[PDB]
Short mmCIF file of C-alpha atoms in Angstrom, two decimals:
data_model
loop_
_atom_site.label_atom_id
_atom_site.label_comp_id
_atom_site.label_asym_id
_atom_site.label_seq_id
_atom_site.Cartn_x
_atom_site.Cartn_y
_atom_site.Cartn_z
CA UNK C 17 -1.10 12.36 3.07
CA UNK C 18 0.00 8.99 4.39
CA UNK C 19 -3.32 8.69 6.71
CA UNK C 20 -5.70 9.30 4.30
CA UNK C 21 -4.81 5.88 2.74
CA UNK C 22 -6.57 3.93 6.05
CA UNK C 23 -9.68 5.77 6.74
CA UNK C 24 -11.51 2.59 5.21
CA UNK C 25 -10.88 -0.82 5.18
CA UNK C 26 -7.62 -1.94 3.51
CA UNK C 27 -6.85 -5.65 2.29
CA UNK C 28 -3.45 -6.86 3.90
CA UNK C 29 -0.81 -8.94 2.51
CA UNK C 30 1.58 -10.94 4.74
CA UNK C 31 4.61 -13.34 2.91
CA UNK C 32 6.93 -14.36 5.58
CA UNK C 33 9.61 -16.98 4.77
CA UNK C 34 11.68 -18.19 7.66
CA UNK C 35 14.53 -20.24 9.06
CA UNK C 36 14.98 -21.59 12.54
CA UNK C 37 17.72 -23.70 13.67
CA UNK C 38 17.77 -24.44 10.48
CA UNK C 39 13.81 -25.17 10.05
CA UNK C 40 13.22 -23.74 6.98
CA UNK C 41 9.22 -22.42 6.65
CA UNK C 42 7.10 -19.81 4.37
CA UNK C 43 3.90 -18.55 5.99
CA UNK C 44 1.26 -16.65 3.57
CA UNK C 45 -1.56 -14.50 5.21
CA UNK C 46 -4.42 -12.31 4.02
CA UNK C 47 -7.51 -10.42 5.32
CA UNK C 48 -8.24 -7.02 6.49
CA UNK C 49 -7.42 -3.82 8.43
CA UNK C 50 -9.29 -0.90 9.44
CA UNK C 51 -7.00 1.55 11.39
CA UNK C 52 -10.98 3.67 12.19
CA UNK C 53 -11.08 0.65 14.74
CA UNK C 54 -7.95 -0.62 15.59
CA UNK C 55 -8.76 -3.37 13.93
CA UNK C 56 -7.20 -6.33 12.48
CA UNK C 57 -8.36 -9.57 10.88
CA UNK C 58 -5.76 -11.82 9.25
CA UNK C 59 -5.72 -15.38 8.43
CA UNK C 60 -2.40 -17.10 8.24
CA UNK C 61 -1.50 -20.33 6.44
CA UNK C 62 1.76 -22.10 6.57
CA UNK C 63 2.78 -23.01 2.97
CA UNK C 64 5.58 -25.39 3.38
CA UNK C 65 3.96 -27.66 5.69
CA UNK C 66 4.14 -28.25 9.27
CA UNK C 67 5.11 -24.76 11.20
CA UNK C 68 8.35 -25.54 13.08
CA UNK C 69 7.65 -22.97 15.61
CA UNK C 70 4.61 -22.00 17.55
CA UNK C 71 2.23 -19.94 16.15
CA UNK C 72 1.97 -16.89 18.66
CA UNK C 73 5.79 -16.76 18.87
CA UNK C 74 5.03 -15.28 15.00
CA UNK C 75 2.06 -12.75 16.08
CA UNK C 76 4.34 -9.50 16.39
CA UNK C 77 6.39 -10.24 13.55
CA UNK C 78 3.56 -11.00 11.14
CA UNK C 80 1.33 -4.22 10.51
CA UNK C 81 1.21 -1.24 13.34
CA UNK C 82 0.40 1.53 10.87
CA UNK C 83 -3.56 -0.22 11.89
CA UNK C 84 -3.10 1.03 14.82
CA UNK C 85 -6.27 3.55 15.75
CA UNK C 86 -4.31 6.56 16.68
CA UNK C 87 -6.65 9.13 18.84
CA UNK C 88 -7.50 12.36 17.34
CA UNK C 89 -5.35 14.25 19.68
CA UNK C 90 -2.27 12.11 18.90
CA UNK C 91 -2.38 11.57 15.17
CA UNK C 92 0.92 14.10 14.97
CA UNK C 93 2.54 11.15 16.55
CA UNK C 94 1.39 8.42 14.38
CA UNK C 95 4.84 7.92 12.51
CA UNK C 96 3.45 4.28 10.45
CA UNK C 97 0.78 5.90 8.36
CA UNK C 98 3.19 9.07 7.86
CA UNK C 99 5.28 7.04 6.21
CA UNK C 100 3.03 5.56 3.53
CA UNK C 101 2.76 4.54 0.41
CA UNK C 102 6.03 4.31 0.49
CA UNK C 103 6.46 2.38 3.63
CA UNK C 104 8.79 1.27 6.00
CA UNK C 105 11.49 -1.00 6.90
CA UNK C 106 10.55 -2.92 10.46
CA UNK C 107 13.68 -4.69 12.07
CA UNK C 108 13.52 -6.34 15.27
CA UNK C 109 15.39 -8.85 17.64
CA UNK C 110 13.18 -11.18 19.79
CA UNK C 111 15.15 -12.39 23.01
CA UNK C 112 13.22 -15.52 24.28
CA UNK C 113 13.97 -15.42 27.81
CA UNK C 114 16.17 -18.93 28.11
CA UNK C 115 16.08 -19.68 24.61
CA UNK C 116 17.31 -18.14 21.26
CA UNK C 117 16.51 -15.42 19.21
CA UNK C 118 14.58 -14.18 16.07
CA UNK C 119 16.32 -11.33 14.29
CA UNK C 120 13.80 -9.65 11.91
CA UNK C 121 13.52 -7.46 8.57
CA UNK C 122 10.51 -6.57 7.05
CA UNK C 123 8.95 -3.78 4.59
CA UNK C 124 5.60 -2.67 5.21
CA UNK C 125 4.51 -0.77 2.24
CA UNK C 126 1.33 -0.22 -0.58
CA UNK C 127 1.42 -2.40 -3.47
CA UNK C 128 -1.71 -1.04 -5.32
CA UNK C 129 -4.59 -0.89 -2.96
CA UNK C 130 -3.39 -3.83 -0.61
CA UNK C 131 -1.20 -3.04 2.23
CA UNK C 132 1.75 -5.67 1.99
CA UNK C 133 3.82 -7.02 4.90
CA UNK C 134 7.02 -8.51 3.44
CA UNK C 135 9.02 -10.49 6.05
CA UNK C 136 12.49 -12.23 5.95
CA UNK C 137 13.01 -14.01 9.85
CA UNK C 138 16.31 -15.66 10.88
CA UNK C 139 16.05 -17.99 14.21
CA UNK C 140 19.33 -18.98 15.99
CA UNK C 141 20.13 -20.92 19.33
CA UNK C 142 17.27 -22.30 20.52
CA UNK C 143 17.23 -25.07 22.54
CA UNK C 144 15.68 -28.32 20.90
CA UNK C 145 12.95 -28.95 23.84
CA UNK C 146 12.39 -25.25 24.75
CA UNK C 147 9.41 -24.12 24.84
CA UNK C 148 9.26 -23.03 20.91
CA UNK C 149 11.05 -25.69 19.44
CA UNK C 150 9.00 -28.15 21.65
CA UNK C 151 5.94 -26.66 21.42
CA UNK C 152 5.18 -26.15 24.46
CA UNK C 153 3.06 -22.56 24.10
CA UNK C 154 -0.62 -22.30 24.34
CA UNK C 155 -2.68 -21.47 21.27
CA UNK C 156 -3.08 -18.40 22.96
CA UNK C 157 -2.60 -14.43 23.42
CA UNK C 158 -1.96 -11.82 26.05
CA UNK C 159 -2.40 -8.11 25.78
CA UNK C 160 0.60 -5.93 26.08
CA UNK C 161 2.35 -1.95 26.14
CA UNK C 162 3.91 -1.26 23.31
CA UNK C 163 6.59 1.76 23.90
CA UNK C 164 7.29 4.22 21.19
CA UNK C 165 10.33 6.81 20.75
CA UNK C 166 11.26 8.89 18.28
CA UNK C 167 15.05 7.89 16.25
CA UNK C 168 15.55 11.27 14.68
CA UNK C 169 18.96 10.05 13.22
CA UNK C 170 17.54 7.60 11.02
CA UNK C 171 14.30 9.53 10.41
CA UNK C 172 12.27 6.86 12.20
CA UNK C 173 11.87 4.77 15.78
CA UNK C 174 12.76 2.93 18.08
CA UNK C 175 10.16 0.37 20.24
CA UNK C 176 10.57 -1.66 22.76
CA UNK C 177 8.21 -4.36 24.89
CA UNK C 178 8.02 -7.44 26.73
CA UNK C 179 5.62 -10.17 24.70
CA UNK C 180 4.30 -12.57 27.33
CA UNK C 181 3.56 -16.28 26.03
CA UNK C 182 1.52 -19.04 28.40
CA UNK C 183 3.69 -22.20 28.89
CA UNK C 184 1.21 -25.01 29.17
CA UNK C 185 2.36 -25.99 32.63
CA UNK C 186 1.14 -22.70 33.47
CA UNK C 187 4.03 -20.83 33.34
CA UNK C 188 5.50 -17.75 31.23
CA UNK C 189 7.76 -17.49 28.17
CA UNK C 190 8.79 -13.89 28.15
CA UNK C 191 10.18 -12.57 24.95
CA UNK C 192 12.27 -8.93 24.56
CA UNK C 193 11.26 -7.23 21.80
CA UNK C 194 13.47 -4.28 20.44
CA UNK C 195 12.71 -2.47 17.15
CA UNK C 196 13.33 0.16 14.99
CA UNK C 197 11.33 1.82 11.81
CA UNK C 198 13.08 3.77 9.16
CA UNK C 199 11.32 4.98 6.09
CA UNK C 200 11.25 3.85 2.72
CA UNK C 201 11.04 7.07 1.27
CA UNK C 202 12.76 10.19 1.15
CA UNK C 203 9.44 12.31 1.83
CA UNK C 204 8.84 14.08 5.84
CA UNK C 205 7.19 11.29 8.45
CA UNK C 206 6.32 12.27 11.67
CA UNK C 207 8.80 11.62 14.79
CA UNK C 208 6.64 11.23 17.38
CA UNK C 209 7.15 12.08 21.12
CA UNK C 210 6.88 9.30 23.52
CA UNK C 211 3.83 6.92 23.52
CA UNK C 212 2.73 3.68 23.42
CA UNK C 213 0.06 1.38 21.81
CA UNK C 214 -1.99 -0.70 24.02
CA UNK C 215 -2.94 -3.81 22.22
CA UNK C 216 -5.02 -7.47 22.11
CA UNK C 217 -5.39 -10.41 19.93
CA UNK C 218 -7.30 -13.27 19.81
CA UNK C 219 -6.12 -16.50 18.14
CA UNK C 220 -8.32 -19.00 16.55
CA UNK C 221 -8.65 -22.19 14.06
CA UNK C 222 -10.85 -22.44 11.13
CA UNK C 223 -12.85 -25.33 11.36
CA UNK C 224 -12.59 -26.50 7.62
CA UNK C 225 -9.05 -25.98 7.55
CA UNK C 226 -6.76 -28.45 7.23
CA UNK C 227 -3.52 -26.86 6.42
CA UNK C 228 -1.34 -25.32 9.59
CA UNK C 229 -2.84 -22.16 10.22
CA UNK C 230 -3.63 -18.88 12.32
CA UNK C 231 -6.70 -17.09 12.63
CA UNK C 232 -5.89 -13.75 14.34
CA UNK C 233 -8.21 -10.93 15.80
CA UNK C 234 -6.47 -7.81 16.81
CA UNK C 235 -7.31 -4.22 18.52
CA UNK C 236 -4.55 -1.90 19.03
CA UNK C 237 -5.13 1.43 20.42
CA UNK C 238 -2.05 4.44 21.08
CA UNK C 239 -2.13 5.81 24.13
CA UNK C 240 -0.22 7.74 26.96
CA UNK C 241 -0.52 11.28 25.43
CA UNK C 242 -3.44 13.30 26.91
#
């Protein structure tokens, strides 16, 4: 049912509108995914002016039912399952030494287009940290993204460690903890333990002048064989 929707390529919607520390911000995004591949391509554009955050600090919460789930393991693929309908994403985002973003989101069809709808909330973070100073490279690393089923709520629970480059050369870590729960009342799969292995490449459009994000993305699940 649900995966029949992405055996193509499907235009994505992203509306995020944020506040942190009290910087208030609305990012837009559009472009492309086509779950065959793994593949995402998404251009980002930040509507109220200057972002007050780095970019990549937004990558994860800015659409994993593109993930390319193997043949083998598509019983465990609970994000497509759970579509049209969708699903609500919540997260918390522990920057190691900083503050936190707490997360909600619904990830659902609106016609054809697949729409990521985000509300983000941004507390104690230190005023020349590495996010509110800007201090991260225009940059991204590849990470493990762990799965589990959360047969209570019908859904998941995910967990992983987002590394960000410092430009001294260090590392901002930040915790990521999630959970999924469906939209709708219909059966979704509750997968057994897994995880999606996943890259992204960040960019800038020459001709544009407004703050932005060009993002390239594989993700691949994994760790069932």
């Amino acid at each position: 049912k649900g995966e029949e929707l992405f055996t193509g390529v499907v235009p994505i919607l992203v509306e995020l509108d944020g506040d942190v520390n009290g910087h208030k911000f609305s990012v837009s995004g559009e472009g492309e995914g086509d779950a065959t591949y793994g593949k995402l391509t998404l251009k980002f554009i930040c509507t109220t002016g200057k972002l007050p955050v780095p970019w990549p600090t937004l990558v994860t919460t800015l659409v994993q039912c593109f993930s390319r789930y193997p043949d083998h393991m598509k019983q465990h693929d609970f994000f497509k399952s759970a579509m049209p309908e969708g699903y609500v994403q919540e997260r918390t985002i522990f920057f190691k030494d900083d503050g936190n973003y707490k997360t909600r989101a619904e990830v659902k069809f609106e016609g054809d287009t697949l729409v990521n709808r985000i509300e983000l909330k941004g507390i104690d973070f230190k005023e020349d940290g590495n996010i509110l100073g800007h201090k991260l490279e225009y940059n991204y690393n590849s990470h493990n993204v762990y799965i589990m089923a959360d047969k209570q709520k019908n859904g998941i629970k995910v967990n992983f460690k987002i590394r960000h480059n410092i430009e001294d050369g260090s590392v901002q870590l930040a915790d990521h903890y999630q959970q999924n729960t469906p939209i709708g009342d219909g059966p979704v799969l509750l997968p057994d333990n897994h995880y999606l292995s996943t890259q992204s490449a960040l960019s800038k459009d020459p001709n544009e002048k407004r703050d932005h994000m060009v993002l390239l993305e594989f993700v691949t699940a994994a760790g069932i064989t």
